[PDB]
């Protein structure tokens, strides 16, 4: 994705109090433009162009975006290939909830907070609204949340939940074991939304077009006060930490969403018979076939060859006939095998799907035709009698002729 980014601010002074995040983001090499969520000159597409390649929403408490930024427009932007980041404090506003419902993640009510009574930091308003999330309940995928070890993080936001049997959604950071999300003023009457360890704090989506979306559910998670604070749970005996470990997590999240950390690409594929160099038309049945693919990973700013322990090749007709592990040689994953007895149209599906990496999918169609009438085995030993028999009688016939026409009666 291109380096141009749009930031939707809330009061235009937020940039000052979020300076650290934006200075880091610019230092990586992005072009940041700051606008106010209600701005008449605001638009994403102009004659079908997508003039902004990345989108950042740091404006909770919005009801209508300025200009033609609908929720269907942002949905078409995510369907086009863009990557959004949205952060929402305890004043949600309707279109952020609706964008979440479009992606598949359901925010909580507009006045709710992730209330936790065992893990609140000392720097609280007496409501226990500030929640100290440990580094244990994280996603545990080094492509997203970085390689290093992190100190307990700080959070002040609205708790969302995601479908358990949802294939696309991710959960970067769940709540604690006792945290519940409900109105801090009103007593609990209904069943509270996302009451346990299914309270989500940071939740991401990796769409079918490989569009990275992160719902953060708390603006202050990215703030300047929480990058430079000091964290300690108010439960007695708990240790005090010098740095909140929020900065490294925020940087790793930002790198993942904007297509910098985990990216995979499929180069040229090539299949041919063992011993030749050009792909034939219509392989025959039970013929040695060699498949070679090249996969590249975006490391820093350049494409390097990929490590790839477990990568599988499927040879499918309607359902897979042969599945094998590709093996690395040179710079390509290549495997040689035999074609099954069934004739038809078979295709190779190489689908690499991992937690954090992009979705790789390359399928090439090939037709496996049965044997020609000349390629059948001939002169088999087991049938030396029959051959003999036939020729014998031919000889017999000839002899008979010479004795039937020139026979001398007696």
């Amino acid at each position: 994705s291109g380096p141009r980014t749009l930031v939707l601010l809330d009061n235009l002074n937020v940039r000052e109090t979020h300076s650290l995040f934006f200075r880091s983001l610019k230092d990586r090499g992005f072009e940041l433009t700051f606008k106010t969520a209600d701005d008449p000159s605001l638009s994403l597409i102009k004659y079908g162009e997508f003039l902004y390649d990345n989108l950042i929403i740091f404006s909770p408490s919005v009801e209508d975006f300025g200009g033609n930024i609908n929720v269907e427009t942002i949905s078409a932007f995510i369907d086009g290939g863009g990557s959004v980041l949205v952060a929402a404090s305890s004043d949600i506003g309707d279109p952020l909830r609706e964008l979440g419902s479009e992606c598949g993640i359901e925010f909580d009510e507009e006045k709710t907070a992730v209330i936790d009574h065992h893990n609140y930091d000392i720097s609280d308003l007496g409501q226990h609204t500030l929640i100290v999330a440990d580094t244990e309940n994280l996603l545990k995928a080094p492509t997203i949340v970085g390689k290093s070890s992190l100190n307990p993080i700080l959070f002040r936001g609205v708790g969302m939940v995601a479908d358990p049997d949802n294939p696309l959604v991710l959960d970067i950071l769940t709540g604690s074991s006792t945290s519940y999300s409900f109105f801090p003023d009103k007593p609990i009457t209904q069943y509270p939304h996302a009451v346990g360890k299914n309270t989500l704090l940071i939740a991401g989506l990796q769409a079918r077009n490989n569009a990275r979306v992160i719902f953060s559910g708390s603006l202050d998670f990215f703030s300047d006060s929480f990058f430079n604070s000091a964290v300690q749970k108010a439960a007695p005996g708990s240790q005090r930490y010098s740095q909140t470990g929020n900065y490294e997590l925020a940087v790793a999240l930002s790198r993942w969403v904007f297509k910098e950390e985990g990216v995979l690409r499929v180069g040229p594929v090539s299949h041919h018979r063992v011993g030749e160099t050009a792909p034939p038309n219509a392989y025959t049945v039970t013929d040695l076939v060699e498949y070679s693919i090249v996969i590249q990973q975006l490391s820093n700013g350049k494409w390097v060859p990929f490590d790839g322990d477990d990568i599988q090749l499927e040879f499918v007709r309607i359902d897979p006939f042969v599945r094998t592990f590709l093996k690395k040689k040179g710079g390509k994953y290549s495997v040689q095998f035999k074609l099954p007895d069934v004739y038809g149209v078979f295709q190779f599906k190489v689908d690499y799907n991992r937690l954090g990496y992009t979705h790789l999918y390359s399928s090439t169609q090939v037709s496996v035709r049965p044997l020609q009438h000349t390629q059948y085995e001939r002169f088999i030993p087991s049938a030396y009698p029959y051959y003999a028999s036939a020729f014998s009688m031919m000889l017999g016939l000839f002899i008979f002729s010479i004795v039937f026409l020139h026979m001398k009666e007696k």
Binding site: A37, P40, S61, E63, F65, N68, G93, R97, L168, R208
Partner: protein, 80 residues
Amino acid sequence: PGFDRTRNAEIGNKDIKFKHLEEAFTSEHWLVRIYKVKAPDNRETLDHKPRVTNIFPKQKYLSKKTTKRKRGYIKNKLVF
């Protein structure tokens, strides 16, 4: 309005919409119709409207937008 010249009977379902198909071609006398099977869903969506309780009034906001006045609204915005 809706009438089938073969099955001389007015169609019961006047409005039908597709979810996984789209119309690709339709001949002049509508004799042959070719539909296109779309790609799978880009992303999954919630089956229900997000959670709304009755503890605080919803107070849904009104559009307030023309083709001339394209300006949104923010609750927590400092006024001048």
